[PDB]
């Protein structure tokens, strides 16, 4: 019986439409989360992988920045409006 062990037990026991940016934000959270979680071993082995695993993780991050670039310039997460304001010109046949 440790104080962490005593505490981690005590506390508990005492039709529609959607925009596809709503769903992409979740679907894209996965890979970016796996990237930032795969970066943990680097930060905890950063000395032992001196200057080799540094370069390796940079090529890793650059490859991932590519996909981020693709996401931005597609404008995936932007919401798009249908009822546009008219910008044609007013032209009268004579």
């Amino acid at each position: 019986m440790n104080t962490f062990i005593i505490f981690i037990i005590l506390i508990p026991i005492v039709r529609l439409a959607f925009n596809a940016a709503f769903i992409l934000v979740a679907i894209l959270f996965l890979p970016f989360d796996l990237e930032i979680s795969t970066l943990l071993p680097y930060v905890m082995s950063i000395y032992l992988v001196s200057n080799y695993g540094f370069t390796i993780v940079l090529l890793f991050l650059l490859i991932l920045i590519i996909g981020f670039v693709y996401e931005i310039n597609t404008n995936a997460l932007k919401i798009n409006k249908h009822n546009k304001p008219n910008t044609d010109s007013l032209i009268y046949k004579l």
């Binding site: 439409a17 959607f18 925009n19 596809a20 798009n80 249908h82």
Partner: protein
């Protein structure tokens, strides 16, 4: 225009020598002349009663003990119609005050269970005697006791024993007393019938669900008390407001389950065990079943055929299987739509995902 649907005439005269001229068409502003007194308007039946009395301008005196349960009665009439007094059966002056200026009195007192300050005797017998003696002293023209169905002076149930003693004492001090004997009442926010079968996690019967009875909608009993308060033919009389259709407990439960579309839970464990579990639950402060009521689970409704009925008042009492839909639709879960097939082709035409 509105109508005095409760009165047959506009000039009425009580048996105490008061003249009561009606005023109006019979709406919120009208006055019936009458002044009544209802000793349990805070409860399930008396609430519907004061609503029907004060809809037409009848002055209503409402003794209360809790200030906060009652407030839902002031809505029922114009200013000055509903009048409130704080009262207790252990204070006599309070009862004389409540009944002094009344042409009509209505006793709805009675718990379905015992307490520390009131046993079944003290509340169904002595309280009736106190009210009767004051109804007699002041010589109130009318008195309308309500004593439970199946009442019998000596019986396995102490409740029905007291309810029978309350009958004979009232009628042996106030000879002109009217006595009503309603059968198990049902309706919206009922005590022990439909809200229980619809909410209680599990039912129990020390018998089988076999106790036979004739239930009745409470609004109709309130209509009956209205049609008795004003009809002076009903002095020294007795009524049996039971209902057209005989229903065993298991029949009611099956209709409740059908209408709810959920499987009501019933257990049917024996008598002594349930009687013990009830006895031990009487020490917590909130009402629960009490040892004397599982005793009444073995006592089906014996109807007295010598007493008047609904048909002596021009009433057409209602049927349970029709009204159960109105009363149980709120607990109806209504899971989802039936048979979604033959809808894919229709759904395929609509845009489900915008970009």
């Amino acid at each position: 225009m509105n109508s005095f649907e409760n009165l047959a005439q506009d000039v009425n005269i009580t048996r105490s020598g008061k003249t009561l001229i009606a005023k109006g068409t019979g709406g919120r502003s009208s006055r019936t002349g009458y002044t009544a007194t209802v000793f349990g308007a805070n409860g399930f039946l008396g609430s519907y009663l004061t609503a029907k009395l004060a809809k037409h301008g009848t002055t209503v005196v409402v003794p209360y003990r809790e200030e906060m349960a009652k407030r839902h009665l002031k809505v029922t009439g114009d200013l000055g119609v509903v009048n409130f007094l704080e009262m207790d059966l252990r204070n006599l002056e309070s009862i004389d005050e409540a009944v002094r200026h009344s042409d009509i009195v209505v006793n709805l007192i009675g718990r379905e269970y015992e307490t520390k300050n009131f046993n079944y005797y003290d509340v169904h017998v002595e309280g009736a005697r106190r009210i009767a003696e004051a109804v007699k002293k002041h010589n109130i023209a009318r008195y309308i006791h309500v004593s439970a169905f199946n009442a019998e002076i000596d019986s396995p149930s102490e409740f029905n024993h007291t309810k029978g003693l309350g009958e004979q004492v009232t009628k042996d001090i106030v000879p002109w007393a009217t006595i009503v004997r309603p059968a198990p009442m049902f309706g919206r926010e009922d005590k022990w019938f439909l809200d229980r079968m619809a909410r209680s996690p599990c039912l129990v019967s020390a018998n089988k669900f076999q106790e036979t009875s004739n239930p009745v909608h409470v609004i109709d009993v309130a209509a009956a008390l209205e049609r008795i308060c004003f009809d002076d033919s009903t002095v020294a009389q007795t009524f049996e407001l039971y209902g057209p259709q005989k229903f065993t407990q298991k029949q009611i439960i099956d209709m409740v389950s059908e209408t709810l579309r959920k499987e009501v839970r019933h257990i049917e464990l024996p008598k002594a065990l349930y009687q013990a579990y009830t006895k031990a639950t009487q020490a917590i402060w909130w009402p629960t079943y009490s040892p004397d009521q599982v005793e009444r689970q073995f006592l089906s409704q014996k109807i007295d055929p010598s007493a008047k009925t609904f048909n002596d008042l021009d009433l057409t009492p209602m049927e349970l299987p029709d009204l159960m839909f109105k009363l149980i639709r709120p607990y109806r879960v209504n899971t989802f739509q039936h048979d979604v097939s033959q809808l894919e082709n229709k759904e395929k035409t609509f845009v489900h995902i915008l970009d």
